[PDB]
């Protein structure tokens, strides 16, 4: 394709996006026009593309590319976006730090989808000046790395917003038993309000971010339950949390003002607005920030509307953060992400929201692929620009090079048949994997035949998809191996309980001689495949924890075989593990009557024994 | 030997102790006499043994056995014990639950040493009636098991005292995400004061213990920092901790009174005694309990005296708890235990203490042998009965069948040359083992040549000792393997840093091809040897956590080899792990100027990454 009206900046972007777009031998002319977010119009090889915001050019050309692929000649497209800012926020604090190359890929995909902004969540994973323990051995970003990421986004006229923490959720930093770090602590993961060395630290955070072009920052500031109840309490006696939050927030905003930043934060702290002089405090502080209403779970527009209404009682400057579910193990939940996005988008439009942030958290080890949620991301983009999903497949094919319905099956390990579609967090991918074999704590939440057959079938389906997945094959290979592994693990784990209950040492011998070696090898192979995935996407740091988890699982599989062999041979008279009555693991979904559940802490799944305390 | 004056009960005990005593063809006559704790007198094959308390008979016969072995014919021994009660308390809450057989061995040894009482520390490791999650998958004792242990001690006229928890330190129980358990929680490891379901639980604890003969119990009741600051705060607003402690303690003592128990507890809660109506509260509650002053660390009599004096300001009923250091990894510290015992014994005698409890805690996984502290136990017995250690070797040979100085070398993995003798907790046995190879967080606390050579020499020494160790060989074999493993791990870990710093890929190839396979195999073999030790001594439950830790260590050794190989081959241009500047791990002993330190949490040693949060 040839172009008229391009800047040199746009020319370089199109070179970077050439592999995504299939424009062929056409001529495109560009126009800037505020009347409508995107317009694409033309026929017989000559097209005119108009965009309102510069970054929208790249969605416009994706739309054109898709329309021509669909066999159109005559093209008439017009989109009015609902949101002035649409952002994706990746988590780089849960052990998985996105490497620069994958950050650049994400940016390119985001650009084509229509996102204006890229955000990284970094608790402790950037460098401060005079804080050598901050991000120590975590793969923290250097100033140069962050500039490289911000500059790459800017090449597509996209913004960059760091998401940091200025009070709590700094657990990886505060663990260091050094006075210069311990003196910063209140309790658990929380910094000490009123401590001048804490305000020195926070100023250090802003001095790092000041090296960026952006002057928009998310400072966190959610309300932790123990704020003021640790070393603060010992130093100052009990204080009302809201007053301490006000005092701390004012200090943080004064520092932000000094460096020219405008701050966003989670709205939680202000819920009480929705003693006389603390109310007055909150009211003056609320004027200085953009509040972000975060909700990842609700299945109906009206629930969202109710919350937007309550927020609008105190401020008109309310952004919304929704969720691309990738924080529940090795497997995402794009399907659930779709369900809530559809409803959240309705409510955001009704309540005149100007900014939507899609969050890609990574809870408890960052085990899900950084690119597992591309379907959810396209879904929010389609909803923001078109208010429907009618073209989600056509556009996704440009973004990713592959089929949307194929890619949605990445979810399969979580998609147990007949689960209600509107319940969040149900994550058998993870707990079926990490539970012990001799002492399987989640055994009562597993349907041994029904779930096994789901995983077996899923592995076959993903195996075929991986063969036509191109540059994303590796993520589907991981999922194919996991599903197959889970099927066999359930077969062996349930098989042991039954055969032991019935004294069938012959079936036990079969398990010990054949199936255990198979399982062990499948786990070793999955570990190898997972490591490839990790290294493609993230910095090496953080992988060590997954090494520990997988290494432990392997040793416990080995133990299970060994214990059974000794029982079969008569070296021991019983396997005491197999004599314990198993109980429900949790009652999280007891009211809904489910068998499956949500279990999202490795250390609680893996053993009943103490491991951290 | 033949006897006159024995009961049938004493006859059965002597049958059980026959293997320990070597009385030969002598005649012994027994007398009960309060004038002196023990007297042994006679010559030419005829001896008279007198004891004050019935259990003292077994120390008396040990003394006789030792004197005859020493070649004496004429025997004149007289001991006045300083303490009416001398107790050993084993930890069965840190994952290592002493099995019945090992409990019986310990009791026999304790009897010969002169202990009156055996205690088990059980947070959640016994059964309650209507609390199926209490001790779930932990190897909790059944009522029958506890009766068996109490009855075995009673066979030697020794008492049994359960040590339980009635407020905090119940972390293994409160982790269960079931409403019937979560409703009992304040925050972290602490139960909810004022909650009637909590008093139902506590009454359940006493109903279990009421099946025992003993009516003496240690109820814990130390003061946790967050007491009242969790769900309590949300339900009731802020309250003074001491008042809440008073309210809870009164409820607990009312329950104890109902079942006929007399309670001991740690003295901490009453330090403030040493608002008008809370002071009055404390003063009336102090009358109803025995307070235990616990101190495991102090190197001088006067420090203890100062504390006894402060305690005696509020009560004359103060017991003392000292420490048999076995809670710092895989290796005990009998040497340090000796040093503080010598001083604590002086202060206990000066301050007219009637009960001393020697505690054998097992912090963070219960990795030290249950029988690793026999030397410390003999030391406290000698000090209680003789006030000196002049016969510690002679008597220990009866207790254990082996040499005291040999057995004291069990400590070697902690005994780095030139450490000051009076600093506690320095535990290279554990942190040198668990630290990563690519990312060695404690590397700056290691002297690579000096420490390696200590461990290498120690392994040779323990190897010889194990060959003459009899029924305890297995514990010295474990220690021999650990010391040898640590020497090589240091050699490889330091070797990698140096060779990588200097670009020596040849030395790197040598490490990768030869030394890594050696190390991996040594770790697998140590795991196997450790598992034998564990299974000899404890219930199977709890071993799973050590499986996880060792399994993780192995996978990380494998990762280190693999990363180096890829670097050597050119698959990668660098090993980023090896480019990080290493910092001190902690500054715990910075004021003392030490290189080695104390690091006693596996999850903080193993990785900088998040693993529990």
Coordinates of C-alpha atoms in Angstrom, one line a residue, chain A residues 225-560:
Chain A
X225 CA -7.0 -3.2 57.0
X226 CA -4.0 -2.9 59.3
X227 CA -3.0 0.6 58.3
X228 CA -1.8 2.3 61.6
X229 CA -2.0 -0.9 63.7
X230 CA 1.6 -2.0 63.7
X231 CA 4.7 0.0 64.5
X232 CA 2.5 3.1 64.0
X233 CA 0.3 2.0 67.0
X234 CA 3.4 1.4 69.1
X235 CA 4.8 4.9 68.2
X236 CA 1.6 7.0 68.3
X237 CA -1.3 5.1 70.0
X238 CA -4.4 4.3 68.1
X239 CA -5.6 6.6 65.3
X240 CA -8.6 6.6 63.0
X241 CA -7.5 4.9 59.7
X242 CA -9.2 7.6 57.5
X243 CA -7.3 10.4 59.2
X244 CA -4.0 8.6 58.7
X245 CA -4.8 7.9 55.1
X246 CA -5.6 11.6 54.6
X247 CA -2.3 12.7 56.2
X248 CA -0.3 10.2 54.1
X249 CA -2.2 11.0 50.9
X250 CA -1.5 14.7 51.3
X251 CA 2.2 14.1 51.7
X252 CA 2.2 11.9 48.6
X253 CA 0.3 14.5 46.5
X254 CA 2.7 17.2 47.7
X255 CA 5.6 15.2 46.4
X256 CA 3.7 14.4 43.2
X257 CA 3.0 18.1 42.8
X258 CA 6.7 19.0 43.2
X259 CA 7.6 16.7 40.2
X260 CA 4.6 17.8 38.1
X261 CA 2.5 14.6 38.3
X262 CA -1.2 14.2 38.2
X263 CA -2.4 11.2 40.3
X264 CA -5.0 8.5 39.8
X265 CA -5.8 6.1 42.7
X266 CA -8.3 3.5 43.7
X267 CA -11.5 5.0 45.0
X268 CA -11.9 2.8 48.1
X269 CA -10.5 5.4 50.5
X270 CA -13.4 7.8 49.7
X271 CA -16.3 5.3 50.1
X272 CA -17.1 6.8 53.5
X273 CA -17.7 10.2 51.8
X274 CA -20.2 8.6 49.4
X275 CA -15.2 13.5 62.6
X276 CA -16.0 17.0 61.2
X277 CA -12.4 17.8 60.3
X278 CA -11.6 14.4 58.7
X279 CA -14.6 14.8 56.4
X280 CA -13.3 18.2 55.4
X281 CA -9.8 16.6 54.8
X282 CA -11.3 14.0 52.5
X283 CA -13.3 16.6 50.6
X284 CA -10.2 18.7 49.8
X285 CA -8.0 15.7 48.9
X286 CA -10.7 14.2 46.5
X287 CA -10.3 17.4 44.4
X288 CA -6.7 16.6 43.7
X289 CA -6.9 13.1 42.3
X290 CA -8.8 11.0 39.7
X291 CA -10.6 8.2 41.4
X292 CA -10.7 4.7 39.8
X293 CA -13.7 2.5 40.5
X294 CA -12.5 -1.1 40.1
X295 CA -14.8 -4.0 39.6
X296 CA -13.9 -7.3 37.9
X297 CA -16.8 -9.5 39.0
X298 CA -20.3 -8.1 38.6
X299 CA -22.7 -9.8 36.1
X300 CA -25.3 -7.0 35.6
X301 CA -25.3 -3.4 34.4
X302 CA -27.4 -2.3 37.3
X303 CA -24.9 -3.3 39.9
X304 CA -22.3 -1.1 38.2
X305 CA -24.8 1.7 37.7
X306 CA -25.4 1.7 41.5
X307 CA -21.7 2.1 42.2
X308 CA -21.2 4.8 39.5
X309 CA -24.1 6.7 41.0
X310 CA -22.6 6.5 44.5
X311 CA -19.2 7.7 43.2
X312 CA -20.7 10.5 41.3
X313 CA -22.1 11.9 44.6
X314 CA -18.6 13.0 45.4
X315 CA -16.8 13.4 42.1
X316 CA -17.4 13.6 38.3
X317 CA -13.7 12.5 37.7
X318 CA -14.3 8.8 38.0
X319 CA -12.4 6.3 35.8
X320 CA -13.4 2.6 35.6
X321 CA -11.1 -0.5 35.8
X322 CA -12.3 -3.8 34.6
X323 CA -10.6 -7.2 34.3
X324 CA -8.9 -9.4 31.8
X325 CA -8.9 -12.5 34.1
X326 CA -5.3 -13.9 34.0
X327 CA -4.6 -14.1 37.8
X328 CA -5.9 -17.6 38.6
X329 CA -3.0 -19.9 37.8
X330 CA -1.7 -21.1 34.5
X331 CA -4.9 -20.6 32.5
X332 CA -6.9 -17.4 31.9
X333 CA -10.6 -16.8 31.8
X334 CA -11.4 -14.8 28.7
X335 CA -15.0 -16.2 28.7
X336 CA -15.7 -14.7 32.1
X337 CA -13.9 -11.6 31.1
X338 CA -16.3 -11.3 28.1
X339 CA -19.4 -11.7 30.2
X340 CA -18.5 -8.9 32.7
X341 CA -17.1 -6.6 29.9
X342 CA -20.4 -6.7 28.1
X343 CA -22.2 -5.5 31.3
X344 CA -19.5 -3.0 32.5
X345 CA -19.4 -1.3 29.0
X346 CA -23.2 -0.7 29.3
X347 CA -22.8 1.0 32.7
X348 CA -19.7 3.0 31.7
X349 CA -21.6 4.4 28.7
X350 CA -24.7 5.2 30.8
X351 CA -22.5 7.0 33.4
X352 CA -20.5 9.0 30.9
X353 CA -17.1 7.4 31.8
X354 CA -14.1 8.9 29.9
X355 CA -11.4 6.4 30.9
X356 CA -11.6 2.6 31.1
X357 CA -8.6 0.6 32.3
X358 CA -8.5 -3.2 31.6
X359 CA -6.3 -4.8 34.2
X360 CA -4.2 -7.9 33.8
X361 CA -3.2 -8.9 37.3
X362 CA -1.0 -11.9 38.0
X363 CA -1.7 -13.0 41.6
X364 CA 0.6 -15.5 43.4
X365 CA 3.6 -16.2 41.0
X366 CA 2.5 -14.8 37.6
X367 CA 1.9 -18.2 36.1
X368 CA -0.4 -17.2 33.3
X369 CA 1.0 -16.1 29.8
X370 CA 1.3 -12.3 29.4
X371 CA -0.5 -12.8 26.1
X372 CA -3.2 -15.2 27.3
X373 CA -5.9 -12.4 27.5
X374 CA -5.7 -11.0 23.9
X375 CA -9.3 -12.1 23.3
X376 CA -10.5 -10.1 26.3
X377 CA -8.5 -7.1 25.2
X378 CA -10.0 -7.2 21.7
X379 CA -13.4 -7.6 23.3
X380 CA -13.1 -4.4 25.3
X381 CA -11.8 -2.5 22.3
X382 CA -14.7 -3.7 20.1
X383 CA -17.1 -2.7 22.9
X384 CA -15.4 0.7 23.3
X385 CA -15.4 1.5 19.6
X386 CA -18.5 -0.3 18.2
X387 CA -20.6 -1.2 21.3
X388 CA -21.0 -4.8 20.0
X389 CA -18.9 -7.8 19.2
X390 CA -20.1 -8.4 15.6
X391 CA -16.6 -7.8 14.1
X392 CA -14.6 -9.2 16.9
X393 CA -13.3 -12.1 14.8
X394 CA -12.4 -10.1 11.8
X395 CA -10.4 -7.5 13.7
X396 CA -8.7 -10.1 16.0
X397 CA -7.4 -11.8 12.9
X398 CA -5.5 -8.6 12.1
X399 CA -4.3 -8.1 15.8
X400 CA -3.0 -11.7 16.3
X401 CA -3.0 -13.5 12.9
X402 CA -5.3 -16.2 14.2
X403 CA -8.9 -17.2 14.8
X404 CA -10.7 -15.6 17.8
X405 CA -12.7 -18.8 18.6
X406 CA -9.5 -20.9 18.5
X407 CA -7.7 -18.5 20.8
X408 CA -10.7 -18.4 23.3
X409 CA -10.1 -22.1 23.9
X410 CA -6.9 -21.1 25.8
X411 CA -9.4 -21.1 28.7
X412 CA -10.2 -24.7 28.5
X413 CA -8.5 -25.8 31.8
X414 CA -10.9 -23.7 33.7
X415 CA -14.0 -24.5 31.6
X416 CA -15.4 -27.4 33.5
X417 CA -18.7 -28.6 31.9
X418 CA -21.9 -27.1 33.4
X419 CA -20.3 -24.5 35.7
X420 CA -22.5 -21.4 35.9
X421 CA -21.1 -18.8 33.5
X422 CA -21.3 -15.9 36.0
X423 CA -19.2 -17.2 38.9
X424 CA -15.7 -15.9 39.0
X425 CA -12.3 -17.4 39.9
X426 CA -13.1 -21.1 39.6
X427 CA -9.6 -22.4 38.8
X428 CA -9.1 -26.1 38.6
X429 CA -6.2 -25.6 36.2
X430 CA -4.1 -24.6 39.2
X431 CA -5.4 -26.6 42.2
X432 CA -5.7 -29.9 40.4
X433 CA -2.1 -29.4 39.4
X434 CA -0.6 -28.4 42.7
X435 CA -2.6 -30.6 45.1
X436 CA -0.7 -33.5 46.6
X437 CA -1.3 -37.1 45.4
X438 CA -1.1 -39.0 48.7
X439 CA -2.9 -36.2 50.6
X440 CA -5.1 -34.5 48.0
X441 CA -6.7 -31.6 49.8
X442 CA -9.1 -30.6 46.9
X443 CA -10.2 -34.1 46.1
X444 CA -13.8 -33.5 47.1
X445 CA -14.0 -30.6 44.6
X446 CA -13.1 -32.8 41.8
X447 CA -15.6 -35.0 39.7
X448 CA -13.1 -37.8 38.9
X449 CA -14.7 -39.0 35.6
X450 CA -16.4 -35.8 34.3
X451 CA -13.4 -33.5 34.9
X452 CA -10.8 -36.1 33.7
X453 CA -12.7 -36.4 30.4
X454 CA -13.0 -32.6 30.0
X455 CA -9.2 -32.3 30.4
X456 CA -8.5 -35.2 28.1
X457 CA -10.7 -33.7 25.4
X458 CA -9.3 -30.2 25.9
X459 CA -5.7 -31.5 25.4
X460 CA -6.7 -32.9 22.0
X461 CA -8.4 -29.7 21.0
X462 CA -5.5 -27.5 22.0
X463 CA -3.0 -29.8 20.4
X464 CA -4.7 -29.1 17.0
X465 CA -4.9 -25.4 17.7
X466 CA -1.2 -25.2 18.5
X467 CA -0.4 -26.5 15.0
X468 CA -2.1 -23.5 13.4
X469 CA -1.2 -20.9 16.1
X470 CA 1.9 -19.4 14.5
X471 CA 3.9 -17.2 16.8
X472 CA 1.5 -18.0 19.7
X473 CA 1.8 -21.8 19.3
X474 CA 3.9 -22.0 22.5
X475 CA 1.1 -20.8 24.7
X476 CA -1.3 -23.4 23.4
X477 CA 1.3 -26.1 23.7
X478 CA 1.7 -25.2 27.4
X479 CA -2.1 -25.5 27.8
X480 CA -2.3 -28.7 25.8
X481 CA 0.3 -30.3 28.1
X482 CA -1.4 -29.1 31.3
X483 CA -4.8 -30.4 30.3
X484 CA -3.3 -33.8 29.5
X485 CA -1.3 -33.8 32.7
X486 CA -4.4 -32.9 34.7
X487 CA -6.4 -35.8 33.2
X488 CA -3.8 -38.4 34.3
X489 CA -3.2 -36.8 37.7
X490 CA -6.9 -37.1 38.5
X491 CA -6.9 -40.7 37.2
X492 CA -4.0 -41.7 39.4
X493 CA -5.0 -39.6 42.5
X494 CA -8.6 -41.0 42.5
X495 CA -7.3 -44.4 41.5
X496 CA -5.1 -44.6 44.6
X497 CA -7.9 -43.7 47.0
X498 CA -10.2 -46.3 45.6
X499 CA -7.7 -49.1 45.2
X500 CA -6.3 -48.5 48.7
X501 CA -9.9 -48.3 50.2
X502 CA -10.5 -51.7 48.6
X503 CA -7.1 -53.3 49.4
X504 CA -6.5 -53.8 45.6
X505 CA -2.6 -54.0 45.7
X506 CA -2.6 -55.3 42.1
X507 CA -4.2 -52.1 40.8
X508 CA -1.8 -50.3 43.1
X509 CA 1.2 -52.1 41.5
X510 CA 0.0 -51.1 38.1
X511 CA -0.2 -47.4 39.2
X512 CA 3.2 -47.6 40.8
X513 CA 5.0 -49.3 37.9
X514 CA 3.4 -47.6 34.9
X515 CA 1.3 -44.6 35.6
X516 CA 3.5 -42.8 38.2
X517 CA 6.5 -42.8 35.8
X518 CA 4.2 -41.5 33.1
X519 CA 3.0 -38.7 35.4
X520 CA 6.4 -37.8 36.6
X521 CA 7.7 -37.4 33.0
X522 CA 4.6 -35.3 32.0
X523 CA 5.3 -33.0 34.9
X524 CA 9.0 -32.7 33.9
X525 CA 7.9 -32.0 30.3
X526 CA 5.4 -29.4 31.4
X527 CA 8.0 -27.7 33.5
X528 CA 10.3 -27.6 30.4
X529 CA 7.5 -26.2 28.2
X530 CA 6.4 -23.7 30.8
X531 CA 10.0 -22.4 31.2
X532 CA 10.1 -21.7 27.4
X533 CA 6.9 -19.8 27.7
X534 CA 8.2 -17.8 30.6
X535 CA 11.5 -17.0 29.0
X536 CA 9.8 -15.8 25.8
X537 CA 7.7 -13.4 27.7
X538 CA 9.4 -12.3 31.0
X539 CA 12.7 -11.5 32.6
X540 CA 14.4 -14.7 34.1
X541 CA 13.9 -13.5 37.7
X542 CA 10.7 -15.0 39.2
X543 CA 11.0 -18.2 37.4
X544 CA 12.8 -19.5 40.5
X545 CA 9.6 -19.7 42.5
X546 CA 8.0 -21.8 39.8
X547 CA 11.1 -24.0 39.9
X548 CA 10.4 -24.4 43.6
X549 CA 6.8 -25.3 43.2
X550 CA 7.3 -27.8 40.3
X551 CA 10.4 -29.3 42.0
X552 CA 8.3 -29.8 45.1
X553 CA 5.4 -31.4 43.1
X554 CA 7.9 -33.8 41.5
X555 CA 9.4 -34.9 44.8
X556 CA 5.9 -35.5 46.2
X557 CA 5.0 -37.6 43.1
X558 CA 8.2 -39.6 43.8
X559 CA 7.2 -39.9 47.4
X560 CA 3.7 -41.2 46.5

